[PDB]
Amino acid sequence: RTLIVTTILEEPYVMYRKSDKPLYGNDRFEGYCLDLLKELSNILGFLYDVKLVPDGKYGAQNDKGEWNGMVKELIDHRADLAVAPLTITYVREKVIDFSKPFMTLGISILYRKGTPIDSADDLAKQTKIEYGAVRDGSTMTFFKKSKISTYEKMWAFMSSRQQSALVKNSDEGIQRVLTTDYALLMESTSIEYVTQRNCNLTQIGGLIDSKGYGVGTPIGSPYRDKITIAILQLQEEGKLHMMKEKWWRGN
Amino acid sequence: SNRTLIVTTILEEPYVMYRKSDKPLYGNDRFEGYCLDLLKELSNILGFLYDVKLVPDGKYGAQNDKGEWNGMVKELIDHRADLAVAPLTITYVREKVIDFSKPFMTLGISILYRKGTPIDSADDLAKQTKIEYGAVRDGSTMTFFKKSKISTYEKMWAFMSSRQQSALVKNSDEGIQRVLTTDYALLMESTSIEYVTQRNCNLTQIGGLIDSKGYGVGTPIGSPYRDKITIAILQLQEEGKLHMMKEKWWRGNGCP
Ligand SMILES: O=C(O)[C@@H]1C[C@H]2C[C@@H](CN3CC(F)(F)C[C@H]3C(=O)O)CC[C@H]2CN1
Ligand SMILES: O=C(O)[C@@H]1C[C@H]2C[C@@H](CN3CC(F)(F)C[C@H]3C(=O)O)CC[C@H]2CN1
Numbered sequence A: 001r002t003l004i005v006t007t008i009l010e011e012p013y014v015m016y017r018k019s020d021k022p023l024y025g026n027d028r029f030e031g032y033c034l035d036l037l038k039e040l041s042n043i044l045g046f047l048y049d050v051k052l053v054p055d056g057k058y059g060a061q062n063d064k065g066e067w068n069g070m071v072k073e074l075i076d077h078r079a080d081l082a083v084a085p086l087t088i089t090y091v092r093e094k095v096i097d098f099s100k101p102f103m104t105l106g107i108s109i110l111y112r113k114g115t116p117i118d119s120a121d122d123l124a125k126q127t128k129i130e131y132g133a134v135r136d137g138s139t140m141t142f143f144k145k146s147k148i149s150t151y152e153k154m155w156a157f158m159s160s161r162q163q164s165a166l167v168k169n170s171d172e173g174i175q176r177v178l179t180t181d182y183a184l185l186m187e188s189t190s191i192e193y194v195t196q197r198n199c200n201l202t203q204i205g206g207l208i209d210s211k212g213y214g215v216g217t218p219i220g221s222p223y224r225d226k227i228t229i230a231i232l233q234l235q236e237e238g239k240l241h242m243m244k245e246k247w248w249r250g251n
Numbered sequence B: 001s002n003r004t005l006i007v008t009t010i011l012e013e014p015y016v017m018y019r020k021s022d023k024p025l026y027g028n029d030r031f032e033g034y035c036l037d038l039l040k041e042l043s044n045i046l047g048f049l050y051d052v053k054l055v056p057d058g059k060y061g062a063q064n065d066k067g068e069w070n071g072m073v074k075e076l077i078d079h080r081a082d083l084a085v086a087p088l089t090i091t092y093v094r095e096k097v098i099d100f101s102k103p104f105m106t107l108g109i110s111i112l113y114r115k116g117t118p119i120d121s122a123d124d125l126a127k128q129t130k131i132e133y134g135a136v137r138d139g140s141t142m143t144f145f146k147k148s149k150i151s152t153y154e155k156m157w158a159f160m161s162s163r164q165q166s167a168l169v170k171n172s173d174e175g176i177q178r179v180l181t182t183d184y185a186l187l188m189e190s191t192s193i194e195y196v197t198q199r200n201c202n203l204t205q206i207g208g209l210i211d212s213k214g215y216g217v218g219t220p221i222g223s224p225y226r227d228k229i230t231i232a233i234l235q236l237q238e239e240g241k242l243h244m245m246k247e248k249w250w251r252g253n254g255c256p
């Protein structure tokens, strides 16, 4: 066959390949997820056709409870697999299958090096260093929904003053950390990408939660089990580690 | 008459433990722990009766030099159990011979060490020799380091295996004692570290997770129970029951 793979542009998982002339088909894209897709293809033996998700969304439910994004593409059988940094959540797991995670991670703190701040507790107990998250992002939502005291206090601070401590998107957030006295709460995968490329920034403290990214399949897929096993094989052989360093290691 | 599933499991604190008693107990009443509570919760979602049987050889399941399997894995292969409800790590080699549900716990390897020091990562340990570090001999964490191709873990394994493997320890209890009495860091599964740090207020988990992995319910290959178990684990997640059960069995005396 040719499997249709839904995916989404997200640096450095899936990016348009630099070119001086128009590119076509799978040659338009490169990145960690394209390399993962290639390894999966080699192990399981399938051909594939990468299609960016038309609405540019990962997948969530609206007020009606209808799904969108890559999740919807799988539900509607317009895609055979989603190979993207798609977070495994029980709400999605109800409607699609997920492989074993190919990346495990958690929320953490991006800030400057050389300071006395060593945890979320240290941020929460003060107000001089501003801190926040990308508005309407996965991490902001974690804080908004937390029932843990420290994280409730943090959300109160973040959501205070008309949410001035929140940012529009990740690049704005990263530049806010660089230019001002500000700490950004974000997924640790994104933090490591930034700290690899900005020597004066660091992850502060450990991970505040745990989550993982998995390959999405429609429920009933003949590829479900085989994908999990292939990811286990790639982890054991050190290949996931190699592909991560390929795309994350920076200047 | 009725279908009672046979469930293989293994004594391992606080997953499966003999219940305290002033008289002999029999049957399922002999046992308590996180996995007994998980099994009860699953049985009330899927609808089944069950009979817990400790794996006779006391092993999780590995292959000998001839490729033959033992432990809970072999009980499943031979259809002497319907389910293995235990902290059975989902691994590549086991996936070739049994099936697993989605994980009911996710975890990794981490570092058990004293509080109040500047050590923050495996890389901090690997780049020095003053603080000794190691793992339980022949355990899953030691096996990870011994097989690792990753640079810093290769360096750590060379330290651990140097000097007649003096940096390794015999079992978890000696490992924990060695961290408490000497300048020693123990590499251990994170679920075991969490159990220890709840009970020893001067110890901490250092750094994040290595070798991410999950524990799943094992079934024989092809079993129709496997997907039903997955569906049930999702429901227990949505109900907050997995978190509740973790708190119940991991909580200690508190630390001031
Ligand atoms: O499946 C999902 O919803 C997410 C979306 C996407 C989320 C980003 C991280 N967020 C993007 C963001 F810019 F919104 C801020 C950041 C965060 O909330 O931590 C990392 C890569 C993806 C991981 N899976
Ligand atoms: O499936 C398996 O082989 C393992 C066995 C068993 C392994 C223990 C962890 N080990 C016990 C130990 F504490 F002695 C050392 C530790 C480790 O390897 O890091 C945790 C509970 C189980 C998780 N699944």
Ligand SMILES: [N+]
Pocket: A225, B094, B095, B096, B097, B098, B099, B100, B221
């Ligand atoms: N399997």
